[PDB]
Symmetry: D2
Subunit: 298 residues, 4 copies
């Protein structure tokens, strides 16, 4: 089973003119590795993959992979709407030394099933890396159903997991039963902080979630506690993760909220975000603060 | 805080010709009281309130109240689309000795907000009983938003709780913060089994959920365990409740599934259901069995 | 082909104390028959069927049928959530002398396909009257798909039409091709005023729509014009019907709006409506007026 | 009033190796200009804008503008998910000699209203060209509401119109009343073929729709007929446009369908499409054929 445990969708730190902030992004990466995370996921939703051009994503992936220097497994998110671009980026990910790619379904056209299976097969056939599907229906307008994920895992041996980004116990549970029942080492990670504990208890594999950026100790210690069999301690950490997603309500996109939380939790990085995200206002920054304080995270 | 803890939406046992089965529905009630539940909810969704005429619901409520004989608090579900009928049934609930009513938003027309607030105020003003709101958007097509529930609790002192029926941690959490933050003794119960533990850990009040019919020990012991501070034991029970809602996938309406589960778990009652529900087929009955067995419930 | 042409969903006139207003409802009926409509539909959505108890609907149907006295075909809307009640009401419609029933899909539980087909078959088998399906997905949360309507017409020879209530050319066109291609004399009526002309031009059969209450001349003359081959004149009337549905935005439910429009267009009836509908306020009454005036309808 | 009448979203012809087909795309353009259209819209949805990288869209826009050589007004679709890319592409559109841009709302993140207004203002401020909004909620997951389109037209003098892509008379009518009532020369075009006639009769301005590629005579003649006051002739053409959108059901994306229809209607171009669209199969190609034949278009 590949890419299990706590794997944060790392934020891409930018300068004020919108270029990659190498020192900042590097410090972030080093904090998270130091925190004990089980991998790193660059150019996810929170990574602002969809506000970036192709060449920029290449640059960011290459840098990110380099700085990690194989200390933990790296995942590059290579998806989008342009299928050829997905292949290009996916192969580049491979050449640049990534351990795997994370591919979302195309999100402008909601593609026929035949075409969706065709698309995921083509991108899977373009690399020899393990490939993680990415479901996020709230944003895509098209759900990767458990049945269809099972069709994809049945078709290609390199389709070996999924980040399931949905506030739904039923989708997580059904994903686990349908897909892991057919493919026991196929990996199921939830996309939201408040579903980690549940995902574990359902027979799933972990979380890729935003709180990994500014508070990875909480998810890392939950996982460690669960693995040591100490469920009580694990549910205690869970109690914090249940509360954390209130902050994501402060803006849309909440990519700015995450960065501001990194700062407030002790890592001073530029919080610049790419449009059409925008700087979080001081009132809401302050409201974010009281929240992090309330939960004993700063 | 009224109507906290484990309060099952009790199944209405029917004869083959569709009349109330007094011996069966009585035995069911007695099992649940014996199991240690904290109240009983008749004529909920699972109670088949919406396949029943007015006079039948009256008869069922009266019988149900009488059999309970004040051993636990009783809630009568009195809602529907016909507002006058809701008042009638709500007052009758009162005369018949109910401890409270449970009122869903009208579910054919999606009511303007002005009318929805007006409707709930008029029903609340028709009784001196405590009143529970009932959110179930999947079926109603209109969500009782935390903000709006807070407007209702602000308006009427007898609107003192909610059964929130949705597979969503965000709605439960937002419901607790918005409404309980403004009204600390306002009751928040979840409508699904897999959300009980989470509901508790979020500062909510319990569950009204189907598994209370055929497996109330699980929810009752979870609650007891959590109240005694033993979180580990409580999460263990939670592990079973995470799995239970698979069975509700076997039919729609799954009212039949619940009854069949009552039987399989040791209480031999007629499983007749009112159309347009229908008898569960033997294959799926058998699939329900293996599931209950897998989970150590029969 | 049964129930073609202009068939209004007639408003049920109530007194200020909420009783059937026999003089008013009778005058309304007589105006419409005099306007040249092709039938009458009582206890539709606009008829307030879902705010009424069973016995009241019987009383209203019986009265309505009796007053019409076979001058035009009468349709009784007998649907709801309670299947047994649907049969009861449907048979009563028959005994009372109705020419057909109009049956919507159950709208609380969104019923499995197997159960939905089973339900419509059972109701169709309970009478010898022609049966009109009623699709209104915005309110039901479950669409009667063309394919499924074709399965129902294929199963029962007395399922002979549909009122399709949806703002969509695609659903209307798809309904016509799938169902009428298989069953040429199967009737397709649209539920909205602005789709009548289109429904005709697509090879459909007419309209059941609210404007038939207060402005049936417009739809009746459109139909007449189209039947005489004078498309220009028919599109002229269409121009008015395109504008009319603005008024339905004034309240929800807009059953009040329709009644107020009946008055303003020259028929002085009580505009009382059953909760949770409410009296339209004077401002909006006035806005309704300017609208009817600007369109040359009062 | 800018960009009124029939303005096709032109297909981008690609070679078999996926490069811009200059001869084919040029012949297409010349057929449409010859057909009497009122403008041309490159890199729309049908233009495959979202399967293309930035540099390719520039190349296509430049070529398209140059070939048109000011014979009709040209619109370049410059939108997407990357805001900076939208500005870049928008300015380039300007330098390259475009008469206007067409900008859709960002369609991955569904952006807060504040950020959406901010985004459209920023892209509008990056050019001096007239700017056409593009609503397509089925694909975007976020509707450009009439109210909001009115807030945008109120804010920026160069936001002067909209292509409204939705199967809904209400949205079109509400768009016209809200926005044109405030801004009489603000242009409202519908995105679907079957809504053109209605859009005209509602006081709107025309259509940008796929049938303009392979059958522009129909829309052009409808417009001409309506403008000459001959409504009958105009509704006749409308009858064909009502039927045409059946073909778009043959695939998703239906970009392939449109190209195949161009061929079948007499213009032999490469029908290659960019993934994740794929070649239409022969059966469906043949079904497309019978359809075009049925309607007297080949």
């Amino acid at each position: 089973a590949l890419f299990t445990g706590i794997i944060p969708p790392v934020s891409t730190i930018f300068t004020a003119d919108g270029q990659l902030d190498k020192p900042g992004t590097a410090a972030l990466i080093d904090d998270l590795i130091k925190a004990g995370v089980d991998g790193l996921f660059f150019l996810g939703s929170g990574g602002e993959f969809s506000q970036l051009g192709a060449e920029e994503r290449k640059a960011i992936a290459r840098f990110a992979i380099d700085h990690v220097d194989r200390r933990v497994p790296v995942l590059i998110g290579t998806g989008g709407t342009n299928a050829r671009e997905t292949i290009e980026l996916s192969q580049h990910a491979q050449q640049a030394g990534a351990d795997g790619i994370v591919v979302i379904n195309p999100y402008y056209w909601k593609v026929s099933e035949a075409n969706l299976i065709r698309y995921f097969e083509q991108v899977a056939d373009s690399v020899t890396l393990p490939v993680m599907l990415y479901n996020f229906p709230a944003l895509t307008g098209q759900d990767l159903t458990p049945a269809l994920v099972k069709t994809l895992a049945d078709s290609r041996s390199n389709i070996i997991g999924i980040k399931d980004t949905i506030d739904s116990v039923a989708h997580l549970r059904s994903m686990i039963h349908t897909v892991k029942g057919a493919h026991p080492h196929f990996t199921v990670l939830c996309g939201y902080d408040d579903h980690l504990f549940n995902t574990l208890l359902l027979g799933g594999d972990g979380a890729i979630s935003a709180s990994g950026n500014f508070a990875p100790q909480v998810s890392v210690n939950l996982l460690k506690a669960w693995r040591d069999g100490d469920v009580a301690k694990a549910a205690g950490y869970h109690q914090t993760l249940l509360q954390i997603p209130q902050m994501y309500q402060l803006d849309t996109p909440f990519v700015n909220v995450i960065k501001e939380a990194i700062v407030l939790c002790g890592r001073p990085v530029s919080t610049h975000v790419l449009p059409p995200a925008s700087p979080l206002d001081e009132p809401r920054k302050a409201q974010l603060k009281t929240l992090l304080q309330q939960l004993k995270l700063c």
